[PDB]
Amino acid sequence: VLCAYVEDPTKSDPPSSSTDQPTTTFTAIDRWYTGRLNSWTKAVKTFSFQAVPLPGAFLSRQGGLNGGAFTATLHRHFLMKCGWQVQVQCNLTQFHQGALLVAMVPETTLDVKPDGKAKSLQELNEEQWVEMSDDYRTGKNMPFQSLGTYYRPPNWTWGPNFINPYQVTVFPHQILNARTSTSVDINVPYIGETPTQSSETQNSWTLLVMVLVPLDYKEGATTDPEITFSVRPTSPYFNGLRNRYT
Amino acid sequence: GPIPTAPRENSLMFLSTTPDDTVPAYGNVRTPPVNYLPGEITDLLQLARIPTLMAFGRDAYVPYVAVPTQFDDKPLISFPITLSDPVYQNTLVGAISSNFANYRGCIQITLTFCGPMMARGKFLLSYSPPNGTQPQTLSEAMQCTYSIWDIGLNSSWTFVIPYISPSDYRETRAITNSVYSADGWFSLHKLTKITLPPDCPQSPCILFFASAGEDYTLRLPVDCNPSYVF
Amino acid sequence: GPIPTAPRENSLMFLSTTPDDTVPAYGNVRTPPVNYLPGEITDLLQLARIPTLMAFGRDAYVPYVAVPTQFDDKPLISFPITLSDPVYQNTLVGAISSNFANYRGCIQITLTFCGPMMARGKFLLSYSPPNGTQPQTLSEAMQCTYSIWDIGLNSSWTFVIPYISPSDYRETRAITNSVYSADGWFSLHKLTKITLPPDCPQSPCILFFASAGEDYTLRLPVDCNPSYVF
Amino acid sequence: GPIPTAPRENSLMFLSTTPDDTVPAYGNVRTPPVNYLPGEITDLLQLARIPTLMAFGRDAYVPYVAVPTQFDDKPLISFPITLSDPVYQNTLVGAISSNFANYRGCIQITLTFCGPMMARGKFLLSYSPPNGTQPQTLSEAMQCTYSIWDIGLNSSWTFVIPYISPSDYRETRAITNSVYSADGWFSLHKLTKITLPPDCPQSPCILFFASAGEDYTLRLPVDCNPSYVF
Amino acid sequence: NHTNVKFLFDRSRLLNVIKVLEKDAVFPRPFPTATGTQQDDGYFCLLTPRPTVASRPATRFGLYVSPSDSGVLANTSLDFNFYSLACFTYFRSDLEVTVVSLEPDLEFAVGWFPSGSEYQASSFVYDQLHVPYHFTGRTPRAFASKGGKVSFVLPWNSVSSVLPVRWGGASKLSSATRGLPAHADWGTIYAFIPRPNEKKSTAVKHVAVYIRYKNARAWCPSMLPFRSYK
Amino acid sequence: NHTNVKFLFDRSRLLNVIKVLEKDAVFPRPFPTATGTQQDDGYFCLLTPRPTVASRPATRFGLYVSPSDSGVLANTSLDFNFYSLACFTYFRSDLEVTVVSLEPDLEFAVGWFPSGSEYQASSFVYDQLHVPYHFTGRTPRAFASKGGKVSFVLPWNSVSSVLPVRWGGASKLSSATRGLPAHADWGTIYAFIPRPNEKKSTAVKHVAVYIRYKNARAWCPSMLPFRSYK
Secondary structure, eight states: OEEOSSSOTTOOOOOSSBSSOOBOOOSOOSOOEEEEEOOOOTTOOTTOBOEEEETHHHHHTTTSOOOTTTHHHHTTEEEEOOBOEEOOEEOOOTTEEEEEEEEEOSSOOTTBOTTSSBOOSSHHHHSSSBOOOHHHHHTTTSOOOOOOSSBOOOEEEEOTTOOOGGGGGGSSEEEEESSSOSBOOEEOOOOOSSSSEESTTOOSEEEEEEEEEEEEEOTTSSOOOOEEEEEOOBSOOBEEEOSOOO | OOEEEOOOTTTTOOOTTOSSOOOBSSOOOOOOOOSSOOOEESBTHHHHSSOEEOOOOOOOOOSEEEOOSOOOSSOSBOOBOOTTSTTSTTSSHHHHGGGSSEEESOEEEEEEEOSOTTOBOEEEEOBBOOOSSOOOSHHHHHSSBOOEEESSSOSSOEEEOOOBOSSSSEESSOSSOSSSSOSOBOOEEEOSOOBOOTTSOSSOEEEEEEEEOTTOEEEOOOOOOOTTOO | OOEEEEEOTTTTOOOTTOSSOOOBSSOOOOOOOOSSOOOEESBTHHHHSSOEEOOOOOOOOOSEEEOOSOOOSSOSBOOBOOTTSTTSTTSSHHHHGGGSSEEESOEEEEEEEOSOTTOBOEEEEOBBOOOSSOOOSHHHHHSSBOOEEESSSOSSOEEEOOOOOSSSSEESSOSSOSSSSOSOBOOEEEOSOOBOOTTSOSSOEEEEEEEEOTTOEEEOOOOOOOTTOO | OOOOEEEOTTTTOOOTTOSSOOOOSSOOOOOOOOSSOOOOOSOTHHHHSSOEEOOOOOOOOOSEEEOOSOOOSSOSBOOBOOTTSTTSTTSSHHHHGGGSSEEESOEEEEEEEOSOTTOBOEEEEOBBOOOSSOOOSHHHHHSSBOOEEESSSOSSOEEEOOOOOSSSSEESSOSSOSSSSOSOBOOEEEOSOOBOOTTSOSSOEEEEEEEEOTTOEEEOOOOOOOTTOO | OTTBHHHHTOSOEEEEEEEEEOSOOOOOOOSSOOTTOOOOOSOEEEOOSSOEETTEEOSSEEEOSSOOSSSBOOOOOOOHHHHTSOOEEEEEEEEEEEEEEOSTTOOOEEEEEOTTOOOOOOEEEETTEEEETTSSSSSOOEEOOTTOOEEEEEOOOSSSSSEESSOOSBSSSSSSOBTOOSSOOSOEEEEEOSSOGGGOOSSOOEEEEEEEEEEEEEEEEOOOOOOOOO | OTTBHHHHTOSOEEEEEEEEEOSOOOOOOOSSOOTTOOOOOSOEEEOOSSOEETTEEOSSOOOOSSOOSSSOOOOOOOOHHHHTSOOEEEEEEEEEEEEEEOSTTOOOEEEEEOTTOOOOOOEEEETTEEEETTSSSSSOOEEOOTTOOEEEEEOOOSSSSSEESSOOSBSSSSSSOBTOOSSOOSOEEEEEOSSOGGGOOSSOOEEEEEEEEEEEEEEEEOOOOOOOOO
């Protein structure tokens, strides 16, 4: 289990940006949350990633990722502060070759259409794998500001939420090789610009499954392995109790 | 001989807030003593903690809230908790703290029921965190942080508004300050319908204050708004 | 009286990298604490030692090396060991170290055989010193510094490239850097012909990394290349 | 507050030979070590003491002195002892010391008889103080400071020229330097007529050097003559 | 230790070339800005390594390739020497600002207002002269000499604990507020000629803003920008 | 402790923009002033945060909205950054005056005379030049360099124990002397070009007066000014 930046990412003090008691728990905290993720085929090119934003996946239900009573606790508290623990499985047989890169990317906008707002659930099914184009390498698709008719719109050539695709192994990562393992185990603590961020609008981590070596299998052999994942928050600290988000 | 000094790049620069003295011109002056004056303000947090009146639109604004006898499932008053909001311009919280840049602490709304003596009833006092839509229903008020104020022995309730924020300090002149909207909402709801005795006036008035908690702290003095003088 | 100071010849000179402070303008600020954030980068050699992917021309370059089944007496891939070479532009060795002027240490190429599980074979990993002509023959590869990587328990080999240099440090943005040409050559050779089982794909891929050794040290920060932003 | 400093009259003056440091711009640099190099010149008087060849007009000058077989009552060679004299321009005494202003010590002419082995004879080595007329006669050479050099075991004689001067130091680029003329005269005289054996060449050659004594000291560096480069 | 994070970012570098105010400014109105809004553009330097546009924090960085006539061009700033060596996510440091004039013998003056505060934009009539309200204030308005340089060290004033080099959340609600931090700045500065508004000249005087990050602390290892292969 | 009273008022801010004297002044005659009085108006800066008019302490503060031609306009000063944070009644502190020139390369000089004293208004004929009597005196006449800034710290000189921020008594007898303290000032300054009166120029050179309250002490908690709701 690839722990991140500490020996124990479960250790977490309550936030110092609150005056109330944090809701440290909810009705099922020792259970996982399993969701689908798109299958990996031969036509997937190199570096074609697929991002699962946390906790952006519990809300939009990316791949049937039902949050149970964690989404219904996240909607009833304003500030949320947890460390994640993902587990991507993919049934790599002996008959496959290739290597996924499962990482937990801090603070990126990879679920954002390089041309608009936020992605839907149908548009995650049409493309199935986000190709590493010039936009995602240069960060040219994090959402541009509406400057207005007064200012002449500048030629946006760079944005600091890029992916350098050759450097994704700096993150907490395990390579899902064809002949070492079949599943990864990443456990990350809380990070953020504040001691606790918001609930509806935070993206402090991002599960990221990137194809480093394209899948090749013989015809008639085992075909097209499915990718699952299992997100589970470790020691959350919910602050600011209010009613359900509108 | 001479001490060889290399003067820096900011030489002959008068900076306004330089934390250092200057040459005394007319020294050796014995000032007359000030031991006789009582109440020396050492710190201006001695006056943010003093409860001062708020204002309410119904330039003739009203420090109290009228209490109509109509029982209803909507707040009797609900103002947002922002220190740039115009229900705090003429307090001593929102007038001291507006001339600074950051705050941290608990606003302490002191209530005072100015109705007749034989009134009996309950009030609900729901502070909400900043949500996407302001809470209106009393059912939406119970689920937030609340405290039930009875007209019993408590004709004066000091509801401590908590400090829940994703940063250690808050921008003190900003409408938004945070995620989407308006930083919170205090809301005085009436819980049971208020029994006012006859031959005692209907529609009482609740008088609101705004002090600061004991842990209220301010930071970064800025140049103030000089538009009090026009 | 006044201390007689003789100011030097560099008076009123703002130098950019002066190792000294300046006058505080807005002091006495208590910053919010940062004890909660894990993983503080004290030193940027904590990220040159993290193995990141390399690039290979076959702007769509490839981090792996395809392994054709044709046995041949020429290297399967052979890139020069220069930190300005475009197989190191998007690593964390060659991207941190390009913004400096000097380096000293051992580049550590971490291999990863991404082929099927029942593959069996050997690979030869020959680092050459900078010679007048690049070594191609496997006989020319055995005479250099080599290490034989089997596809056994080792599906991941970290070949430490030695540091052999006539100076204590090396120019880190220079094609030549030394006597005549190109600073060395790593070369992954295939030694025995690779037995891939049928109904398992031919032409496997070996994935290359580029970390830095534990003794890797850098020196003299220079102004970087701002051409990442166009 | 501020320390009241009165800057001197030489403020903002860059003087070339100021014996003091300046601001470091690119500090914290670990230089590569130089323990491996042998022979560190701490002091340039380690090379004035090394005997180097002189020059003699007979730009093709001659380091030796031919010895004609004609016995004669006049010096075989007699050059003046002045460190601006052109028999010292390409030594290491007269090339180091010409770039200074003052010297003090003993020039040490090392002779070397380069004739055949079975030569037998005597030479007289007369240093004269600066007189109004140069000594020529061997009778005029005996009365000065002399030392008789035999071709015996001594095929190499180091005649220490004394330091006799009315000042503690001497002007090192000056023809006159003193009272009327030319600062002294070394003069190698032949004393007995030289027996050279037959079937061994007549007219041998004596090779002259010019080192400095152990008490040779220099003072006041001046800007050198840059006319070596044209 | 030249890769030390506290050592590497502790040096001065250019941020923005802003125009010097000669009247009471109108701070640039927030996005989107419709045409016909009379305001003062590009006079303010939002002190942040992150990309800016119109002196407000921006998501992306954007320069101009063919700047034609229609529309108002926008002062977009970026710290080029930062992001090429910013292989991390969070970065708290105390800023050191140096404002170098780009006008021969300019007497300017540098205002400031903290992270979250705002410019005071009006003028008071002192002695029938419109003296603006940025000559006064509780924030540092350092004054330069005629031909001098303004330098001071600013603290980490913002309400965020750290500055996100990379940020993925939403400050306000979504739909193009993703990756746009609101409180990631040390404040904003601006240059003004310390003369009243009736002495407004006709030339448009520029000034340059340098930045040194005192006591740099970086967290959460992340990527470096992509270098092309052309 | 940024709300500390000794810390909050300990920073420089603008008070008045006064004109620089070029002859022997006539101090403004006390109120009421009839027409035709030849005097010198607005050249004196009565160093007080309280409102002034014609360099004398005033009850109210008054600016001009439509300054037409008839009558002599009056230099009315006020400390805008004080009263918005002066939630107290009494305030004793030692003043620090800084006089910044608003004229390019001006050589001025700053007089002073204490609380209760008066300007010396005549001239003595030195060498057939009318040198006025404000070049001499036992009070500080600090001299500026050509393009420099005058700065000194003045003590609490007045005969009152403290300065009433709010005052309700009567200094003289009643009928429009209510709320007008007489001895609430650190004195008065004035700028003069240090040339005799025959070298009086034609331009009207201004200068600006800053104020820092060293060692601020405040007593008797009171109100803050009323912010409008428009």
